[PDB]
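User: For a benchmark we're assembling, each entry needs the component sequences followed by a predicted structure for the full assembly. Here are entry 17's components. Please fill in the structure.
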Amino acid sequence: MNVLIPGIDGMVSAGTLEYTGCCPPSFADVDECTLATAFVGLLPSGPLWDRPKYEAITTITEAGNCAACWTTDHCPTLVDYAVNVGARLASVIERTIWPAVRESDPFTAVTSTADWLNRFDWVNCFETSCRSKELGEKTPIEYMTDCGPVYVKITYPPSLQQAFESALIKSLERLSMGIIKNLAAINFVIEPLKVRVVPVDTTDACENETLCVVLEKTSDFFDGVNANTCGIPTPVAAYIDRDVMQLPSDLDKYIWPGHMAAECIVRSLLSHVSRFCLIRTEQAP
Amino acid sequence: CTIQRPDPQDLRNDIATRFSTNVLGGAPIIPESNEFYVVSLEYAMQEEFYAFGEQMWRERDPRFACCENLVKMAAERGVYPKPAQFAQGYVRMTGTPGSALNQGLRFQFGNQTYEPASVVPDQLPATGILVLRVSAVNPGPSGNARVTDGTLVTPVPGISSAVTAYGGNFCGGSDEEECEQFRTRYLQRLQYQPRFTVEWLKSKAAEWPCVTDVFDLGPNCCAVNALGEVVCPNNFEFYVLFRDTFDCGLAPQCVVDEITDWLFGSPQGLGLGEAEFGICGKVRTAAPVKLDIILDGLSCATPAQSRVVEERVTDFVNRLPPSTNLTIDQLRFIGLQVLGPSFNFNVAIRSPNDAVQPGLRFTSCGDAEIDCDYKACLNSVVVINNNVTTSGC
Amino acid sequence: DCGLAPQCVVDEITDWLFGSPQGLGLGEAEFGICGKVRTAAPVKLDIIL
Amino acid sequence: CTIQRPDPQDLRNDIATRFSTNVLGGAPIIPESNEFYVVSLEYAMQEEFYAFGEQMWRERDPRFACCENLVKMAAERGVYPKPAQFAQGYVRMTGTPGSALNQGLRFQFGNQTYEPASVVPDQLPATGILVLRVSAVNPGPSGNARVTDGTLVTPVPGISSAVTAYGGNFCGGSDEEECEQFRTRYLQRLQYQPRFTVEWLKSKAAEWPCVTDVFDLGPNCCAVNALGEVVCPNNFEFYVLFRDTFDCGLAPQCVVDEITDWLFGSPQGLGLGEAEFGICGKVRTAAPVKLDIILDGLSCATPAQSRVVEERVTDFVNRLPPSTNLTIDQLRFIGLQVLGPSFNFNVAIRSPNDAVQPGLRFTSCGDAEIDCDYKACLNSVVVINNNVTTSGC
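Assistant: Structure for entry 17:
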C-alpha cells in the first residue's frame, strides 16, 4: 500500500531523499551585479586602492549590463575596469555555457530540438508517400484526389513546432531505455506527447480478435520550454485549426501532431502482435 | 580530447603575449605597472570561466552529481527512490456462515497491526473459513515477524476473535534507500534493457508475498499455447509453491487467482498488468497427493547414513514440481550415492492405507504417475528390513 | 560454396534461435517471437568483360 | 556451537548493568553517549572472546584440526602418516663369468628406470647368471609395472644387454598419503569399532605386495540354515584384487593360498602367522564373468561428455567387488550424473556372443546377477552411433 506512480519498468512506488545541503550554485545564481562587485576583490590593497575599492557603486542600465555609477565626483582608477571584466564574465557565462549545457540533455534542450530529432533518426510515418495501408485509409494530413491520397507537408508555427519536438524528444529518450511492452509503461513513454492508450474491450478478450485500442487526449497543451534560467515553461496549444492555416479543405478540422507521433510510436512497438487495432477519433479542443 | 583546461602559468603566458602583441606593439609587460594588473585581471576572468565550466559539466554526470541533481534527471526518466515497504502475510478467520463482514478490519499480531490488502467478501463463505492476504500498517522490517496467533481488534458479530497467521510468516518488509543506494539501481539501470523472457515472468512472479518456488508446467500436461485466432504462442501458465507457508506447499485457488489478476492483468489480454500487451496466461496451483515411501534395507546401515538418506528423501519429495511422476529410479539414487554400490537398498511407493486418490496411478515399473494439478506430498517415510543379511552378526 | 549452407545447418540455427516449438521462450528469442532462418540455392553466372 | 552463546540481548543487558553499577553508581546510561559506545565495544570484544574460546576447543578435535595439528595429535597416539614407496622386484641378468661389475647398474624396463637395492657382487658368479633385488628410481605409482623383458642402460663389457624381470611384476609402488586420507584413517582408530579383528585382518592383508584392493564377502554370498535364519560366519574370510598384474585383478588360487598361509599360519589358529592366537580364516579369489556394455544415445552429447561417461563406466565396472550384481540402474545413474536428467540414454548389459557363463544369470529386469566366488569383468564398452546428431545431416 503506497500509492504507486509510473516508470520505464512498470508502476513503481516512489519516495523522497533527504536534503543534503551541498549542491554547487548553478546558472540561476550567476548574476552580473553580484560578481562584478565580487571581481573588485582581486585588486591589491593600499592607500591607492582602498578608497576606490570602497566607493565602487554598481547600477543596472536598460539592458541589464551592471555598470558603474559615475557620480559627479568620480576618480578614474582600475577598479571600474574590474567591474567591467566581472560583468563581462557574467555575460559570457550566460551566453556560452548556459546554452551548450541546456542543449546537451534531451529534457532541457530548447534551441537544438532539430539536431536531437536527427540524432534519434526519427522518421515520420504520415509524411512518406509509401505508407502502410493499415495506417488508415486516409490519414489526417492527406487530401484526396483521383490518384488516391496525397500528403501535404505542414509548416507549423515556430513555437508549436518547438514544443512538439521537445515532447517527442522526451518521449524518445524515455523509450531509449527499453521499456516492457505493457500498457502502463507505454503510456508513461508517450506521456510527454499528452495522449494515452486505452483499450476498448472489457470482457477478457483472449479469443476475441481485433484487440482494438483507442487514443485519448490527456490535455490540449504541450508543456513548452523556458529558454531562461529560472521560471516556468510557457505552455502552448497543441492543435491547429485547418481554416486558419489555409490548408486544403479535405484535411480534418483540427490536426494534432502529438497524436500522430504517438500513433507512430505505439504502432511500431506493438507491431509483432498479429491482431492489433488502433482507432483514431477526431478530438475537438 | 586534445581540448582541456590550460595550465595556469601557460594560460597567463598566452594572455600576456596576446596583450603585448595586439596592444602594446610588442613591449614587455613590466611588473607592477597598470598593464600588469590588467593582464592579471583578465587571466583571472578566464580561469573563473574554465572553473565554472568544469563545475556544471560535472553536475550533469550521474556518477558525480549532487543528490538532488540526481533525483531529477532520474525522475524524468522514471527511476525513483524506493520507500520503506510494508510486509504482507496470510490469515484465517472463522465464524458463523453468512455473518456480516466489514471493510475496516484490523488484526493484532503481537505488537503489530495488520489490515486486509485485498477486497473483503460481503459475507463469510458458507464453509465458515476465510483466508485473507493482510499487510502491516507500519512499514519497515519490524513488520517481518514470526507470530502465529493474533486477535481481532474490531469485534465483529458472529466471528471468532482469534485468528491464526497462515504459517506464521509475514514477509515482505524493508527499509528506505539512501543517496548512495539510489546511485546504484540508477545508472546500473541505464546499462540494462529488459526483454520479456520466460526468465522475466519466472522472476516477476516470485515477488508475490511469500512465494517460494515457481515451476513451469509439467510433463503430464497438454498445455495449450494459442488462445485465439492467432498463429504462434500467446499463452503462458505456471505453478507456484508456498513451501514454508501452506501445507505441502500448495495454496488454494483464492490466493493464486489474485496473482493471476495482478501479473497478466484483468481484463486479461490487453497488457493491463505487468505482462506484455497481448499475452494471456494463468498462475495455477495443484492439489496434494499423499505418498508413503518404504525404504527397505536401511536399518543395516550406520544410523548416520540412515539419517542422511531420510533427510535427503524427505527434501527431494517436498520439492517435486507439480504434475511430475515420482519415479523409483530417482529415489534409488539418493541411496546409491551415500550407501555405495555394495549395499542392498530397495525403495517402494505406496498410497496411505492402500487407498485410492484422484490423479494417482501406478505404472508397470512401480512409479507414481500424477496428473496435472496434482503434486506428490510426503506423508511418511518408513524404514523396514525383511531380507536377512550378515551386516548384523 | 558461395557461402550457401545445406538445409540442416540453418535448421539447427533456427532451433537454437527460436526454440522447439518456436515462440515459447525456450531459445534466445523472446516469448511469443516466432520465425525462421533460411538458406538459398546457387545459380551459376558467368561474367565477361 | 559448543560453548553456550547466550542470548545477545541478555548479554548486552548484563554488560550495561555491570557498567552502571560500577562506574555510574547505579544510574542508567544516556543513549548515544561515550558510555553507550564503550558498552557496545566491550560487547563486541566479549563476542570475539566467546569465538576464540570455541575455536581453541575446536583445534584439539581430530575431525576439525589443521593438518599440522592433526599430525602432531596422531603422533601421540601411535598413528603416523604413510610415506612414499618405491617399486621393487628382481632382475635376472646374464653374461660371461668373471666379468667386472660396479654399483652403477641401471635397467630400463619399458619407460621406467630401476637400480640395485642390495650390494652388487664384485664379480659375476661362475654360474653365468645373477639375480638382483631391484628398486625403482622414482617413487610413486608409476614405478609399478607388468613387464617381462628389459634392457641394460649402462653397458658393461661381457654382459648381454637383455635382462629379464624375475617374476614379471614390480609391486609396492605407492605415493605419499594425503591429509584427508590420514585424517579419516586416524579417526577410525579412536572411534568404537565393532568386529575389530575383521578390519585389522583386512588392513594387514592390504600390505601384501601387489594387493590392490581388499573387499568383504559380497551380498550374494550369505547363507541360511534349514530353519530359515541367517547364519553368522565363525571364520574371517574376504577377497583381494591384484588390479595391476592379472586379468581383472583376479589371481590364481596358489597366490591367495600363500597369502592365507602368511596371514593366519599353518596350521591356522596357533598364532604362527600374523594374526593373534585362535584366529582362523581364509583369503579367497574369484572367477571372471565377461560382460559387454552397450551405450545408446551418446552421440547426441558433446565429445567431452561422451569420453568422460565412457571412462566413468569403465572405472565403475572394473572396481566392482566380487559377489555383487551389476545392475542397469547403476550405469544409468553414472550416465545421468553427467549428461543431465532430461537426456535420452539407454544402457544394455550382454554376454559375449550370447554364450552362457557359469555363475551369471540375467534377471527379467535386465540386471546381471552374479553368484559367489565370481566377479564381473569388462570385456568391451561399445557405443552405438547411428549418425544421430543435434542438427540432422
